[PDB]
């Protein structure tokens, strides 16, 4: 019985026929070969196909175990610590650039206003080349989404207002090739507080709603309203152990005097997804060292 699956990358869509004994790895490997991606360890096959949960597919398990064409999103799952130092291929860099830009523009990654303008200008340099008073004049940037909706909502400028501010930065990017404009975009984005972080809805022992963030450097607890500023930070080197059992997850600090952090997930599968990102990020962190 053939199963229809769609995989989308940030600038491609692929439709596949797979059998019930096709592995996640066979799907992943044919995606990466089609697009010519070598730096595979950053990436994964995403799917909101739990009974409602955002998840990452397992490569050494048959696709035919967890399911909501079957829809998959080929996306970066782990983020480098330093984008300029670590991303080797232009394709890898482009795929991060597009994924990160979508997170910013969709309001998912908070962005200050002047940063949004500057980022938008690099995106403009990447999509349009050098600004030319001849080629790009009045309204060259209408029809273009360049600033997050929450930035515009909180501010008092019109669309032409915004294009104008972006246009004055575009011109300073004369001589910048596209690939380099995409990296400069990432150099700025990777300084944003929400960049590169996987957020999970958790509760402490008192029943307060919190966020857990897992990122390349460790674990963070946020109050429900402040996803930018970690309330509690757990860098890998400050963790004695991490554990879960069903819905209960515990972080034990290296400081024998300091107390455990205990929180609760809504289901077992959430805690499993948290720990796999924990393991994946810790291992990449150790591999860099």
């Amino acid at each position: 019985k053939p199963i229809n699956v769609r995989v989308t990358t940030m600038d491609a869509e692929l439709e596949f026929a797979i059998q019930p004994n096709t592995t996640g790895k066979q799907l992943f490997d044919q995606v990466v070969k089609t697009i010519g991606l070598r730096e595979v360890w950053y990436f994964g096959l995403h799917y909101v196909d739990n009974k409602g949960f955002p998840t990452w597919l397992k490569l050494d398990k048959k696709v035919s175990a967890q399911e909501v064409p079957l829809q998959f999103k080929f996306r970066a799952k782990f983020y480098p610590e330093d984008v300029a130092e670590e991303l080797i291929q232009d394709i890898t860099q482009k795929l991060f650039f597009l994924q990160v830009k979508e997170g910013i523009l969709s309001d998912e990654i908070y962005c200050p206003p002047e940063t949004a303008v500057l980022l938008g200008s690099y995106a403009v340099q990447a999509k349009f080349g050098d600004y030319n008073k001849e080629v790009h004049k009045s309204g060259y940037l209408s029809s273009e989404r360049l600033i997050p909706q929450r930035v515009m909502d909180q501010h008092k400028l019109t669309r032409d207002q915004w294009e104008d501010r972006i246009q004055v930065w575009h011109a300073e990017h004369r001589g910048m090739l596209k690939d380099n404009a995409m990296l400069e975009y990432l150099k700025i984005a990777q300084d944003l507080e929400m960049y590169g972080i996987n957020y999970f809805e958790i509760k402490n022992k008192k029943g307060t709603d919190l966020w857990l963030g897992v990122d390349a450097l460790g674990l963070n607890i946020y109050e429900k309203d402040d996803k930018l500023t970690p309330k509690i930070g757990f860098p890998w080197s400050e963790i004695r152990n991490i554990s879960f059992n069903d819905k209960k997850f515990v972080i034990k600090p290296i400081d024998k005097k300091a107390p455990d952090f205990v929180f609760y997930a809504p289901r077992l599968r959430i805690n499993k997804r948290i720990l796999q990102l924990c393991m994946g990020n810790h291992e990449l962190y150790m591999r860099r060292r």
């Binding site: 600038d11 491609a12 869509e13 799907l27 044919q30």
Partner: peptide
């Protein structure tokens, strides 16, 4: 035998 079979592709340039 279990290897996926590509039936469709869309590539966005811009």
């Amino acid at each position: 035998d279990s290897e996926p079979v590509l039936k469709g592709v869309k590539l966005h340039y811009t």
